[model samples]
Target: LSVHVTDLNRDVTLRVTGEVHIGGVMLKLVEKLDVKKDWSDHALWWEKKRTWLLKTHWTLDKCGIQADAKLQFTPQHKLLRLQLPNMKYVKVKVNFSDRVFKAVSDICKTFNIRHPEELSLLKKPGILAVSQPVTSPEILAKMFKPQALLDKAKTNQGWLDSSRSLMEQDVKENEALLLRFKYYSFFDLNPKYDAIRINQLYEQAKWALLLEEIECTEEEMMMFAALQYHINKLSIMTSENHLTTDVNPECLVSPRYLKKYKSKQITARILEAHQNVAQMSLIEAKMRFIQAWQSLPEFGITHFIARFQGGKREELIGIAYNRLIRMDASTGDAIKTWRFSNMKQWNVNWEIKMVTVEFADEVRLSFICTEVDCKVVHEFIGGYIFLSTRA
Candidate 1:
C-alpha cells in the first residue's frame, strides 16, 4: 500500500478543486488509516472505486474541542473499499476540502446564517430595474407655494357681459360675487385632509388627467358608453356620505360623495399585484379574466364585463349593446376603463393607475392596467405594495 501524507496542522486552510483517491498511483492514500466516520454512501465495490471522507472530533483538558477531518478515498471506475465506525458526537466526516463544507459548518455554528459567498443566490429578483425620481421636494414646494391671489385679478368685458345677461334674466349669479377678492391663508385653507375628501379630489383629478391622454376609436367610444353605465352601477353599490378632514369645523357631508364613489389610495402599507388586464387586446384580456375565474378552486365566476374608453377616432361606433373584437383609436385620449363580476367573491373598484410599459422609443410610458392576481392582491393587503401614484 502507498501513502500520501498531508500535514493539515501547518496550514489551517485547504481548497480541493478536483477528485482525491486512496491507495493508487493517481493519489497515493494508504488503507492503514482508521476511518472513525464516513460521509460517503456505505458500499463495497471490487470494480468501481469509492471516495470516503472521515471526520473526527477531540478535546484536550485545557483546550476546546478540535476537529480532525480527512477524505480517504479512491476515484470512481476503479476497485475500492472503505471502513468507517459510526459514532455520534465523537466523529464527523468530510469530503475534499471544498468551501461547501466550510460554509455548512459556519452556518451550523451561527444558527444557520449562511456565508456571504452563498448569499448571492438569495438575490434573484431585481427590483431597481425601473424607477422614477423622488417626488418629495416637488410636493413640498407645491404645498406652500401659492400660485396667484384670486381676488386681485382684473375682470374682462366677457365676464361683465355674461353677468349683465344673467341679471337681466333674474339669475342669482353675479359677476361681482364671482370676482370677489379672496386671500387663501392658513385659516381659510383646508389642509391635512382626511381620507374621504382626499379620495374625492384625488379620483376626480385622476379622471380629468386621464381624459387628457387617451383617445378612443369609434368602437371604443361605444364600448366606453357601456362602460360608463357599469361605473354608475358600481358607484351606487359603494356610495356613502363623504366625510372631510378635521380641517372643517363641522363634519359636513359633501355632495361630491353622491356623484361618484372612488377607492381611497390611502395606505398604511403596500402590496404587489399583476399588471392591468385592460391594456391587452379585448380577446387576450377576456382570456385572462376567464383563467382567473376558472382557476378559483371553489366559486366559479359566471358573468364578467369589461369596458374601455379611449383610443378614439372621430366617429362614434354607435352600438349600445354589443361585443366587438378590435378597434382603432382616433379622437382625444381618454378612457374610463371598468370591469364587473357577478360572483359574490369579487366586486371591486379599480383605482386609476399608470402602468409603465416599454415603448418603441425605449422610454417607459404610463397607461391604465388592472391587477387581478391573488398574490398581488394579498401583497397590497399586506402593505408590501405602496400607493405611489395619484388620482
Candidate 2:
C-alpha cells in the first residue's frame, strides 16, 4: 500500500509495493529530497492514535496499514535527566537511538553501577506540579523532588519502553524522568519504606489544591480551602514552631474572589475548617489531604481549549486521570466525560491542529476537535490508559 509523508517543509505521497518494507520508503524519501538520512532519520506513522513506529523490516501488510496511511519525519537527540534517589537528578544527552534500556545503562554508568533491568525511566508528570509559580511550602518542595510519584500513587502511566527511542517514548527534551524500580508492583507500596514516593503524592494533591483547578463540588472546594488554609496557618499556629519550609508560606486557599463566592465569607469558612484537621499531626494531615483527592476522577487534569466541529466557542478539554473531559471553560462544569474504558481509538493529524477521537458503545461516535497541540492530547490517552491498568 502507498502512504503519504511529510517532513514539515515537504509533503510527498510515495508509491510502494508489498515487496519492500517501511525503511525502504523512508530511505527513498530522503534520497528524493537529496538530504542525508539524519534529517529524515526518524519516521512515525504521521497520523496519531493510528500512529505506528514499525521496525525497519516490518512490512506494510503485516502492519495492517490501509490505503492513504500517513508517515512523517522530524529529528532530535534529547537532553534529558534521570532523577536520583536523594532528591536530585543526573543529566545526560539522549541520542535518538537511545532506548530506555540503553539509557539506563548510561545512567548506571554514571553511578558506576549495574542492573538496568531493575530500573525504568518514567516521564515526569509535570502537570501536577503547577506553580503560579508558587504554592504551599510542601507543594513547592515537589518542584525539585523528582516526578513519577502520582503514577505510583495508585496511578500508573505505564513504563518507559525498554527497547524504543526516548524520543519516540514521549520523553520531552530536557525532561527529568524518574529512575523507578521496574522489575516491579499494587504494586504493594508500604509506608516509611516507600515514604518518599508517598510524600511526593501528598505534595501533588496539595499542588492540585493550589491550582484551584481540580474539578470538585462546592462543598469540597470550601473544604479544601479550609484544609488548605489549615495547611498554611499551621506555620503561625505555634509562631515559635513553623518548620523550615513552612514559615510564612503563601496561599491560594480560596479563589481570589468569586462574584457570589466573595473573599470575606471565603476567609470565614477557611478559618472554621482550619480546626477541622487542627489536632492531626503534620504527617497525618498530609496523608489525609492525599486521601481526599486520591479518588477524585477529575483531579490533576492537564486542561486544554479546543473548538469542536459543532461549536464556535472553545470548550475546555482536559486530559488526565485516564479520561477525556469536555467542560465549560468559564466554569469547571463538566460537559462530558469520555472514559478510556469506552474509547475505541483516536487519531491526531499532527500537521493540523486537530485530534479526532472515537468511542465505542462500539456503534462508534466520532469526534473531531481543533487544539493548538493535538499530539499531547493524544499522548495522555495512550499513556494514562496503559498506566492506569492494574498490575
Candidate 3:
C-alpha cells in the first residue's frame, strides 16, 4: 500500500507506503502500518500514471487499505493519494490546523483565558502546550471593562433586577452601598425612616417628656421649676440688674440689655391696673428674647453692634402693642408720643454702644448704651414694649 500528498501552495508531493492487515470475518480490521499520511484529504491517483498525488489530508482512520480509497479536502489543488498494494493494510495519522491553534492561542492569551481543560493542560510539566486556549467575546469583555469589574456599587433593593436574572442579595447589597447616597436627592421613595418613623420617634420623645412631668418627685419638680426660671430669665439675665428703682434685686428678667428703645407710656390710672400684667408679659418676652439670643452665632454680637449703630436714620422701634381692659381687672397701658431730643444722642452713641440680636432674622435685640447713665434692657422689637418696664 502507498499514500501520497501534494501541496499546491508549496508545489510539492510526498509519497510513502505501509502494510495492510485484516484479521476477522464480518468484523472491523486492525493493523499497524508505517505510512506517511496527508492531513489534507485532497488526494487523487492516476492508475495509468502509476503515481499518487498526495495532498496533506492526513487523519488516523480515513486512509483505508481496502482499495484506492480517496478523500476530498479544502482548496482543491491540494490533493492526497492512497493505494493498497495488498488489501490487508492500515495506517494512522494525526492532523491539526496549526493556524487555528495559533489564532486561538493568541486570542486566549490576549484575554487571559481560563477554563477547566486548559487549566489541566497547564498543570502538565513536560507536555508540548497542546491546549489551544480559545477565547470568546465574553472573555474579552472580562479583560478590559470586564462586566465582573464594572462599578457594582449603587445597586438598590428595588433595582436588583436584570432583564433575565434577579440579582441576589450578595451582589445587590454591596452594589446599593457603593452608590453615593448624599448626591442623589430624589430617593425619598419608601425611605428607610419615613414619616411613620418620625412619628414614632416623636411619640416616644413626647411620652418621655410627659412621663418626666407626671412621675417627678416634689424635689425634682422644684429643681425643674428652678431650671425653667433661669431659662426664662435668659434675656433679662443678660440685661442690667435693674432698669429702674422700683424693680427688686431678686426680681428676675431676661439677661440682654435694650438694643433699641421703641416707645414709652405713663398713665397713672392705667399703670396702676396693668402693672402686674405688664410685668408678666415682660417676663414672657424676656424668655423668648433669650431663646432667640442663644440661637445667634458666638461672634454675632460684634456684627450686630456694627450694623445697629449705623446712622440709618429710619431705623424703626415700635412694639407690637397689646392691651386688655377686663371688667374684674382692667390691666392696660396706653402710649403717648415722647420728645425727639433722644434722636441725636442715639446717633452719637451709635458709634460707641454695642448691640446684638439672638439671631440675624429674629426680631429681638439687646444693647448697652454708651451714654453715662443709660440703662440696659433686652427688648423684643416685632410686637411692642421694650419688655424692660411695663408701666
- Writing each residue's lDDT as its tens digit, candidate 1 over 105-155 gives 332233222121211000001111111122355643443322111110111
Residue-pair clash count for candidate 2:
3
Model 3, span 242-302: residue lDDT tens: 3444643222323231222211322333234445454444344433322332332210110
Candidate 1, residue 98: CA error in Å? 57
Task: Please identify model 3 stretches exceeding 4 Å from their true place.
Answer: 1-210, 213-215, 239-391
Which has the greatest TM-score?
A: 2
lDDT of 2 by residue, 1-391 (tens): 3344444566666667755677786677666666544553455554454344557788768776656665555444556776653334667665555566777777655544344444566654332121122435665455443222222221233446566666556655667787654332113334434334444445545544554424568877787667755655552442332223442222444334554456556555655555443423434555566667766655556555566656657566666655667767666567777777777877777666667777876534333444424544555555566565646
**lDDT winner, 2 or 3:** 2
What lDDT is reached at residue 362 by model 1? 41
Worst 10 residues of 2 by lDDT: 126-135
* TM-score quality measure for candidate 2: 0.42
In candidate 3, position 233 carries an lDDT of 50
| Best-performing candidate as measured by lDDT | 2
Query: Model 1, poorest ten-residue lDDT window?
Result: 120-129
